Design a protein around this ligand. Structure first.
Ligand SMILES: CCCCCCCCCCCCCCCCCC(=O)OC[C@H](COP(=O)([O-])OCC(O)COP(=O)([O-])OC[C@@H](COC(=O)CCCCCCCCCCCCCCCCC)OC(=O)CCCCCCCCCCCCCCCCC)OC(=O)CCCCCCCCCCCCCCCCC
Ligand SMILES: CCCCCCCCCCCCCCCCCC(=O)OC[C@H](COP(=O)([O-])OCC[N+](C)(C)C)OC(=O)CCCCCCCCCCCCCCCCC
Ligand SMILES: CCCCCCCC/C=C\CCCCCCCC(=O)OC[C@H](COP(=O)(O)OCCN)OC(=O)CCCCCCC/C=C\CCCCCCCC
Ligand SMILES: CCCCCCCCCCCCCCCCCC(=O)OC[C@H](COP(=O)(O)OCCN)OC(=O)CCCCCCCCCCCCCCCCC
Ligand SMILES: *P(=O)(O)OCC(C)(C)[C@H](O)C(=O)NCCC(=O)NCCSC(=O)CCCCCCCCCCCCC
Lengths: 174, 67, 125, 128, 274, 104, 178, 55, 87, 459, 63
């Protein structure tokens, strides 16, 4: 459907086998599906058609809010409260966006596991790798900031990580 | 149906419950016999169990001890 | 249950096979030319049939055929006797192959014991 | 003869097996009569107050009041610091605290050592 | 650990069941033993057999409990097999329903319990299992036959022991129809469910003949031994109970000690110390 | 209160207490819903010994059965494609160690 | 439960209670009726054998020995009547027992739903209120100055009187209230 | 039984909680069904509230 | 459920049991005859009679109350009073 | 926040100028209106708090507590009108004035944007509470209870005042936003250790921490019904709110100074549950249950993770509602029989059916029955503690088992069994009491329906 | 008549509501309702693309 992006929420093309009966007995599932279509599907479809027809008469729109980029805590001077506040708010919004990214990847993983069913171990290796990478990056960024997390604390953690990486690289090149 | 209580005597029974109990017991035994007639391998097995002592060293790939 | 447990526990574990270590001898040791087992169903076919990984043995093709026969003849759930028997026969053949492997391991172990005993006797003499 | 029954704290001695029930002194009968008289007086008071038509309320129980007072308010005034009380209080109020502190401190020290050594499986451990 | 827990549970609960005098207690211990058997089934890596046994046991154990309740209601809230008796002819339909349920529970060769219990026993015998767990499972099957024999023998066979005022009346359509609905399932549902589900595991086609008959042999052995021991009760011979009988009847002394000692210590610590 | 007489006409039949009689310090612990101290047909020491012996025997025999298991005279089961290397989640890029099963 | 207990049990009462308890537990052991009759006749034969004993000390010793034998040989799971204290149906209906003082708190509409019953209830209440003074006076007249030495209660010594302390005995909830 | 309607309501509530437990897809919902059947068992075992053994 | 008891039914059943007792002659048995004074029984016989009535009616009479039931009419009155029988 | 503060300061003249027979009606109606107005604060932002002005601000942590206070006031009014029928009009107006002042101080406390103003207001909450307890309590022990409560709280709080003024002198501001944006690490030294001790000990005494809790049984048992309702629902949450607010500047010293408090909280949670198992007084049982729940909240705050703060907030709200309901039920039974002994009145299930239903629901919510917000908060705290260490699961499991045991023990003892024979003054439950129970319980289930409203800023 | 009135309400109305909820609201966000992919056997016809999944190789038939 056009409600969601098929690229953001991937789904393999469905392959439903054609029915090839081998008995002269009737199909109770087929009969019950026909009865369900005649008793439930058509009434709910008519009701939804009327509701959508009512909706189309008073059509109106809502928008997606856009935020421009602002200087971050690295650019903010020491004890500059206005810039610090702006950077903290931007960092919090980006944190929420990253959380939703991790949620999207996790939902993709769950859906692929359920879809593949009995052979999920092999067929879902692609989605497990993406989740592994995303979770590793997210954990490295926001692992142990604490209850009173802040952009300053995350920046300090990144500085510590960069210092450790630089020391390791210098030791390797030595 | 109203069943009068008895004192120190066998209770009053009904032909309906008598025939229902007989019918369902006969149904159980008929089902058991009918199943044992058709698929008897569900109880007695279907495939023989090999006797490994009768397998030859030729087919088991065992060379002579001296060789 | 069985006599093999009694032989291994109340007897010579050296002459009885280890189920966890079997086989302990090369596959061609005693077989001049030995043929690899033939697999009929392919990996893609088994994956499409979504057989359980416990069920993807060398008897998987008969299981796939049985599943297809069962799905097609749905209301008549008694029309797959031949396919069920074929799958069971293949499983029986696999089990007797495993039994042959166990017996081969046992007699190879006792043959090795006899050979090493004879070599020890020759060294002693 | 038959094996004897050993009474315990949580499986007491049955009345029929009590040796004191087969050695009845004349003093014991007088004591039993006195106990029955006490019970009868209490029962008479309760039954009078219970069958009074004009009573509307709860019959106060002095025994219940004494029980609830002794269980709650009369404990501290009768407490004297003795060696037994001091040892029991120290044990039951300090030992568990230090025991759990030791357990959790050792666990967290091992966890931190593993984290520093970088050989602890922390993958997928996003929520904390 | 699951296999060992299930084995000890089924053995202990069956052993406690074979000597209870309350029919509801006997059925409850039978339920516990069947749960232990299901836990054994899970422990040998046979999860689907456990679910199949869940369904079959639901059917026939529900019917058995309904028959027990009918007996209790007919005999004026009497739950003692020592006071029941003569109900084979006093109550025909509940009698035949209980006999069918007991046969299904013990693994009658083609009833509802056959398509789960027999496969469970074969899987236990044919797998890489704990020897003690396997032995306890077999003994628990025998004791299952034993306590089913006890229920039937002391509830339906013999002479009446209930009070003289006979208020027996099982002609209610509600009771009859409910037991009928749960009775057709206790005979035919196993076959239908077994033949309709797809194969969830590889079958055990090849096995020794004696190992194929292990469930039936132990079931018949338990039936015969329990029947002989129960028939010995008619003799005019009175003997004091044994240590094993006291242990089995009193639930292994587990409720006594474990319900009096730990609770006493915890409650005493609650007030004396805290 | 479980030990107390059930047939007596107590003022509090469920609690089995009379009005005005002294209340035990541990009444809240000795109610019929709580710890019971009534005599048993078997001695407490005998019950404890039997229960502990039974559970210890079961644990010991479970350990013995674990070290002496029960199996069948068969070899390991054989699976086609390198013991199902790819189906169990093997790395497609990395080449597995080949596993070959022969006829017998 | 309807009889006021005495200060002690006599030797005859002790031995009779032991006899009944032993017979009950033997019946628990001997499930079948003919076997129970046989062994109960043997038990009564034992009691008859010890029935005549001039030495009360020896009689008490025999009673103690019999009590020990019973405690050893008792059935671990004896038969108990369903309504009896150990029974499966004991105290099942205690939640359905509601008293008349709860009854008199009803709304006027609820009372009006049952016109004839409450007239008789008011007659009973008038009878209760017109007799309490006589009951308490009779109780305090007959009791010794020291106090009641037993839980027994006197009957109505007069033609126009009711037995003292009767209201709750008479108006106790029915055995199967609902 | 004076409260057979309440008894049937309790049976239906137990059935609902058991269905929740069986059909639950995540651990929190499975725990919801778990505790629901537990509390319904508590309510139905002590059906006769005047019975100390039932409590 | 069960039919209610009546005074006549209780009396008939207790007399039935007592006439099936073999130490009592049914001809000289009436609802007012005493077990000890005019029937010639003793304490053990009275205990057996009380146990028989307990079996007959399916409820237990406590030992403190059973010792005082010295007459068939007393047994009838006690059972009716306990079972709430008034007609 | 003035749109909520001023209506209470107008409730005061309304109470003092209303007619003698309309005081309760007016106070209840306008308290409900103020609660409806204060429901607007639940519309929180996802990035920062609601800064109304330089003095008052609202947050995702402050909003649910304010709504709880505004909703709790009318329930206290109903209970007070129940138990104060014979008082004179002037004393009724004084009692209502005390309740109004307490609500006003609580609102200003939860909305104060500066630490010193927060301290002033959360200390000001003592005076109306002390007056209510020591004036309208029933027993002789109300005086001793008030003394214990007042002196415990003040001995805790005075070093907090010294610490706050010292922090102001050192850093330049006590504004919460400033101390959060300008927070600096706390070095390991004796001076910083004692500053940490001052702040945390003040709030632990307010919590209360195990070993500092005796004032809670003393005050809760001996206070009137309204005092007991406000002491457990809101006044206990001042410590948790303060600890959540104050721990911004105490890091990383909290990682090392939390061990004694964590051990005390866990073991005392176990001990107070065990005490609840063997309590002869119903109010004492409820008070010790409150102690256990607040000890769990203390554990969550001390371990100090984003998952613990959410569970802590949810548990605070749920415990407030549940404790208020339990205290109300106990007060109704006390008004029936004029005694607090738990075993005095039994068979209330067969004497008062709907009240037994209210008891059952309250007991079910007291133990963590899913999907109630009690369970949500407790489970979040348990999971955070499991991440902290893997024996906290042992302690939490023991606590949960004992919690279920004592909750159902209270329910069975009070409701099940057979009624007391001689207690014949148990009139049918009043419409007012049933409405009070319904208003206690329904918001709990609605919050279960919508859980994110009480999970705090960390959500 | 009672059976018909019961069946229409208790079964028909809830199934209408549930089908409307699932078809137009639940199946409007991704991954809300996920069906396990159908099993495909050799010698089959994939309906979406008109594909023919081929048969397996010859079996080494035994008896
Ligand atoms: C620390 C130990 C840990 C042990 C762990 C392992 C435990 C395993 C236990 C297994 C079960 C044991 C038997 C039941 C015990 C309870 C008996 C009881 O209470 O009965 C009363 C109860 C009836 O009581 P009641 O009607 O209320 O009346 C009261 C009695 O009158 C009252 O009369 P009573 O008191 O005289 O009756 C009891 C008395 C008589 O009852 C019995 O003997 C019943 C059991 C008879 C059958 C079991 C033995 C033979 C089984 C195999 C036979 C065939 C073998 C194969 C042959 C062919 C091979 C090719 O029992 C005994 O004397 C003991 C026998 C059992 C011993 C168990 C193991 C040792 C326990 C500890 C040591 C002390 C033992 C001595 C006793 C205490 C000291 C004095 O009996 C029954 O209901 C029937 C019980 C037996 C039915 C089932 C029989 C078959 C199933 C068990 C055997 C396994 C068969 C399959 C094997 C498969 C292998 C692959
Ligand atoms: C005369 C007899 C008096 C008896 C008084 C007994 C009081 C007992 C209750 C209070 C103390 C509880 C201690 C619990 C045991 C664990 C202690 C612990 O974790 O120590 C190590 C902890 C942590 O130290 P650490 O060992 O983890 O540090 C190692 C880490 N590095 C390397 C970075 C240093 O020590 C402290 O926390 C020291 C400061 C404690 C300040 C005082 C407050 C304690 C709590 C007071 C509660 C008051 C109310 C209750 C009492 C009334
Ligand atoms: C023993 C446990 C504590 C007993 C409490 C007894 C109450 C009175 C104690 C008097 C204070 C004890 C010393 C406290 C440490 C102190 O005063 O200074 C702390 C520090 C040092 O400041 P500087 O002068 O700048 O240092 C020099 C830097 N170049 O300043 C601060 O942090 C101010 C904080 C005030 C805390 C003082 C009291 C806190 C200690 C009490 C523990 C918590 C209260 C417990 C309540 C129980 C009451 C007994
Ligand atoms: C029924 C389950 C199968 C039982 C199989 C019994 C096999 C024989 C046996 O247990 O022998 C005793 C064995 C000593 O044999 P061994 O292997 O030498 O052990 C020395 C330990 N290093 O000793 C052991 O293995 C120790 C435990 C013996 C338990 C025997 C049973 C009681
Ligand atoms: P009535 O008032 O006539 O009653 C006559 C009595 C018995 C009161 C006599 O007047 C009397 O007191 N006689 C002397 C005292 C006496 O008889 N003492 C001995 C009696 S006890 C006794 O002999 C019991 C022995 C056998 C029964 C023992 C029970 C043990 C078996 C139980 C096993 C448990 C399961 C079966």
């Amino acid at each position: 459907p056009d409600s969601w992006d098929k690229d953001v929420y991937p789904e393999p093309p469905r392959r439903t086998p054609a029915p090839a009966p081998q008995t002269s007995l009737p199909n109770p599932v087929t009969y019950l599906t026909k009865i369900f279509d005649l008793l439930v599907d058509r009434p709910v479809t008519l009701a939804r058609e009327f509701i959508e027809q009512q909706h189309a008469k008073n059509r109106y729109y809502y928008y997606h809010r856009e935020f421009r980029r602002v200087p971050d805590i690295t650019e903010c001077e020491e004890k500059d409260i206005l810039c610090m506040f702006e950077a903290e708010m931007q960092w919090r919004r980006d944190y929420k966006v990253d959380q939703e990214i991790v949620n999207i990847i996790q939902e993709r993983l769950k859906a692929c596991q359920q879809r593949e069913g009995e052979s999920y171990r092999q067929n879902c290796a692609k989605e497990l790798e993406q989740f592994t990478q995303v979770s590793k990056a997210f954990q490295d960024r926001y692992s142990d900031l604490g209850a009173h997390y802040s952009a300053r604390k995350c920046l300090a953690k990144q500085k510590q990580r960069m210092l450790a990486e630089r020391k390791a690289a210098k030791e390797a090149a030595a | 149906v109203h069943i009068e209580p008895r004192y120190r005597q066998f209770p009053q029974l009904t032909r309906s419950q008598l025939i229902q109990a007989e019918f369902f017991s006969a149904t159980m035994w008929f089902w058991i016999l009918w199943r044992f007639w058709h698929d008897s391998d569900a109880v007695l097995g279907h495939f023989p169990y090999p006797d490994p002592s009768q397998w030859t060293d030729e087919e088991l790939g065992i060379l002579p001890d001296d060789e | 249950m069985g006599a093999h447990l009694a032989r291994r526990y109340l007897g010579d574990a050296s002459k009885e096979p280890d189920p966890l270590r079997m086989p302990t001898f090369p596959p061609d040791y005693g077989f001049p030319e030995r043929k690899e087992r033939e697999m009929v169903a392919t990996q893609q076919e088994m994956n499409d049939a979504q057989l359980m990984l416990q069920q993807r043995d060398y008897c998987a093709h008969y299981l796939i055929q049985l599943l297809k026969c069962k799905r097609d003849s749905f209301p008549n759930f008694l029309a797959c006797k031949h396919e069920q028997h074929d799958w069971d026969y293949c499983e029986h053949l696999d089990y007797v192959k495993r039994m042959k492997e166990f017996e081969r391991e046992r007699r190879l172990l006792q043959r090795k014991k006899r050979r090493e005993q004879r070599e020890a006797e020759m060294a002693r003499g | 003869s038959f094996p004897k029954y050993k009474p315990s704290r949580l499986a007491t001695l049955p009345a029929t097996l009590d040796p004191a029930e087969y050695d009845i002194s004349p003093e014991t009968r007088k004591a039993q009569a006195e106990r029955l008289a006490i019970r009868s007086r209490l029962k008479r008071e309760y039954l009078l107050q219970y069958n009074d038509p004009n009573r509307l309320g709860v019959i106060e129980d002095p025994a219940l009041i004494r029980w609830t007072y002794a269980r709650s308010a009369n404990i501290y005034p009768n407490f004297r610091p003795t060696p037994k009380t001091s040892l029991l209080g120290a044990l039951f109020g300090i030992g568990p605290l230090f025991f759990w502190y030791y357990v959790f401190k050792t666990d967290r020290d091992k966890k931190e050592k593993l984290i520093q050594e970088g050989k602890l499986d922390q993958t997928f451990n996003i929520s904390y | 650990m699951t296999l060992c827990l299930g084995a000890i549970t089924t053995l202990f609960t069956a052993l406690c069941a074979i000597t209870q005098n309350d029919i509801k207690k006997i059925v409850a211990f039978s339920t516990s033993s069947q749960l232990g058997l299901m836990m054994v089934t899970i422990g040998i890596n046979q999860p689907h057999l456990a679910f199949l046994h869940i369904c079959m046991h639901a059917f026939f154990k529900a019917m058995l409990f309904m028959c027990s309740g009918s007996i209790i209601h007919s005999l004026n809230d009497e739950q003692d097999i020592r006071k029941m008796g003569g109900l084979y002819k006093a109550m025909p339909f509940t009698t035949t329903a209980l006999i069918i349920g007991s046969l299904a529970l013990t693994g009658m060769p083609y009833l509802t319990g056959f398509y789960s219990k027999d496969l469970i026993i074969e899987a236990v015998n044919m797998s890489y299992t704990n020897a003690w767990a396997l032995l306890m499972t077999l003994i628990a099957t025998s004791l299952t036959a034993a306590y089913s024999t006890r229920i039937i023998f002391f509830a339906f066979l013999g002479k009446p022991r209930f009070p003289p005022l006979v208020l027996i009346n099982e002609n209610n359509p509600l009771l009859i129809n409910s037991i009928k609905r749960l009775l057709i399932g206790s005979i035919f549902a196993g076959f239908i469910i077994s033949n309709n589900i797809p194969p969830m595991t590889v079958p055990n086609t090849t096995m020794p003949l004696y190992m194929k008959m292990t469930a039936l042999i132990v079931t018949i052995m338990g039936f015969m031994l329990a029947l002989e021991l129960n028939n010995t009760t008619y003799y005019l011979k009175f003997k004091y109970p044994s240590q094993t009988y006291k242990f089995s009847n009193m639930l292994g002394y587990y409720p006594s000690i474990m319900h009096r000692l730990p609770t006493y210590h915890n409650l005493s610590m609650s007030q004396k110390s805290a | 209160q479980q030990e107390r007489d059930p047939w007596y006409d107590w003022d509090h039949p469920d609690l089995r207490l009379n009005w005005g009689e002294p209340i035990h310090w541990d009444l809240d612990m000795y109610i019929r819903n709580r710890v019971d101290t009534s005599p048993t047909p078997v001695s407490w020491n005998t019950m404890c010994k039997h229960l502990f012996g039974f559970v210890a025997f079961m644990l010991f025999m479970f350990w013995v059965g674990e070290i002496y298991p029960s199996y069948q005279p068969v070899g390991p089961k054989q699976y086609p494609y390198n013991d199902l290397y790819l189906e169990r989640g093997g790395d497609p890029t990395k080449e597995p160690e080949p596993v070959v099963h022969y006829e017998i | 439960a309807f009889s006021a207990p005495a200060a002690y049990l006599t030797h005859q009462q002790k031995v009779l209670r032991l006899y009944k308890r032993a017979l009950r537990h033997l019946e628990s052991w001997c499930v079948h009726r003919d076997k129970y009759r046989y062994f109960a006749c043997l038990m009564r034969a034992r009691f008859d054998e010890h029935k005549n004993e001039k030495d009360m000390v020896k009689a008490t010793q025999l009673l103690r020995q019999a009590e020990e034998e019973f405690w050893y040989g008792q059935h671990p799971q004896p038969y108990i009547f369903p309504e009896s204290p150990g029974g499966t149906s004991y105290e099942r209906y205690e939640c359905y027992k509601v008293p008349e003082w709860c009854l008199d708190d009803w709304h006027p509409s609820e009372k009006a739903m049952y016109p004839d019953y409450f007239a008789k209830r008011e007659q009973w209440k008038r009878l209760r209120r017109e007799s309490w003074e006589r009951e308490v006076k009779q109780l305090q007249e007959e009791t010794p100055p020291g106090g009641p030495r037993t839980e027994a209660l006197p009957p109505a010594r007069k033609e126009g009187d009711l037995p003292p302390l009767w209201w709750h005995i008479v108006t106790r909830p029915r055995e199967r209230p609902m | 039984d004076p409260f057979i309607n309440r008894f049937f309501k309790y049976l239906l509530l137990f059935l609902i909680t058991m269905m929740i437990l069986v059909t639950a897809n995540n651990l929190f919902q499975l725990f919801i069904g778990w505790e629901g059947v537990g509390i319904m068992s508590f309510l139905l075992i002590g059906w006769w509230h005047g019975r100390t053994d039932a409590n | 459920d069960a039919p209610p008891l009546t005074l006549e039914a209780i009396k008939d059943r207790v007399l039935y049991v007592l006439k099936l007792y073999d130490k009592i002659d049914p001809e000289k048995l009436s609802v007012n005859s005493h077990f000890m004074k005019d029937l010639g029984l003793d304490s053990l016989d009275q205990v057996e009679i009380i146990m028989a009535m307990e079996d007959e009616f399916g409820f237990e009479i406590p030992d403190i109350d059973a010792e005082k039931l010295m007459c068939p009419q007393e047994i009838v009155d006690y059972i009716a009073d306990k079972k709430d029988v008034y007609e | 926040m003035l749109k909520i503060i001023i209506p209470t300061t107008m409730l005061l003249p309304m109470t003092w100028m209303s007619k003698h027979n309309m005081i309760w009606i007016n106070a209840t109606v306008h308290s409900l209106l103020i609660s409806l107005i204060s429901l607007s604060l639940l519309n929180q932002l996802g990035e920062n708090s609601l800064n109304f002005s330089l003095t008052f601000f609202s947050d995702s942590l402050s909003a649910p507590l304010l709504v709880l206070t505004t909703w709790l006031l009318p329930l206290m009014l109903m209970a007070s009108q129940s138990h104060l029928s014979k008082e004179t009009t002037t004393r009724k107006k004084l009692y209502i004035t005390m309740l109004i002042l307490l609500q006003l101080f609580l609102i200003m406390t939860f909305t104060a944007t500066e630490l010193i103003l927060f301290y002033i207001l959360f200390e000001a909450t003592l005076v109306p509470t002390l007056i209510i307890i020591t004036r309208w309590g029933n027993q002789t022990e109300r005086l001793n209870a008030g003394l214990y409560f007042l002196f415990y709280t003040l001995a805790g709080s005075l070093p907090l005042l010294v610490a706050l003024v010292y922090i102001q002198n050192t850093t330049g501001s006590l504004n919460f936003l400033i101390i959060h944006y300008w927070s600096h690490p706390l070095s390991n030294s004796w001076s910083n250790i004692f500053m940490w001790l001052a702040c945390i000990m003040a709030f632990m005494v307010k919590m209360p921490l195990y070993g500092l809790h005796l004032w809670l049984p003393k005050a809760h048992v001996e206070a009137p019904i309204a005092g007991s309702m406000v002491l457990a629902a809101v006044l206990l949450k001042l410590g948790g709110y303060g600890m959540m607010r104050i721990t911004t500047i105490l890091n990383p010293l909290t990682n090392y100074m939390a061990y004694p408090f964590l051990m005390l909280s866990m073991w005392g949670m176990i001990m107070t549950s065990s005490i609840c198992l063997r309590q002869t007084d119903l109010k004492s049982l409820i008070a010790y249950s409150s102690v256990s729940h607040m000890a769990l909240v203390i554990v969550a705050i001390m371990i100090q993770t984003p998952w613990s703060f959410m569970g802590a907030t949810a548990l605070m709200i749920a415990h407030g509602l549940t404790s208020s309901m339990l205290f109300c039920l106990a007060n109704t039974n006390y008004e029936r029989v004029h005694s607090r002994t738990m075993i005095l009145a039994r068979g209330l299930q067969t004497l008062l059916p709907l009240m037994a239903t209210w008891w059952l629901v309250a007991s079910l919510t007291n133990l963590a029955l899913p999907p109630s917000i009690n369970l949500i908060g407790e489970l979040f705290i348990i999971t955070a503690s499991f991440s902290w260490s893997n024996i906290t699961i042992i302690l939490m499991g023991m606590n949960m088992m004992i919690t279920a045991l004592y909750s159902l023990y209270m329910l069975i003892t009070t409701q099940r069994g057979k009624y007391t024979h001689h207690i014949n003054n148990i009139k049918p439950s009043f419409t007012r009491e049933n409405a009070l129970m319904a208003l206690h319980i329904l918001p709990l289930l609605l919050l279960t329906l919508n859980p994110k409203m009480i999970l705090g800023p960390l959500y | 008549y009672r059976h018909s009135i019961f069946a229409v309400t208790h079964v028909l109305i809830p199934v209408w509501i549930i089908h409307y909820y699932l078809k137009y609201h639940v199946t409007a966000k991704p991954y809300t309702v996920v069906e396990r992919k159908p099993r495909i056997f050799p010698g089959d016809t994939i309906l979406e693309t008109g594909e023919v999944i081929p048969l397996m190789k010859e079996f080494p038939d035994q008896h």
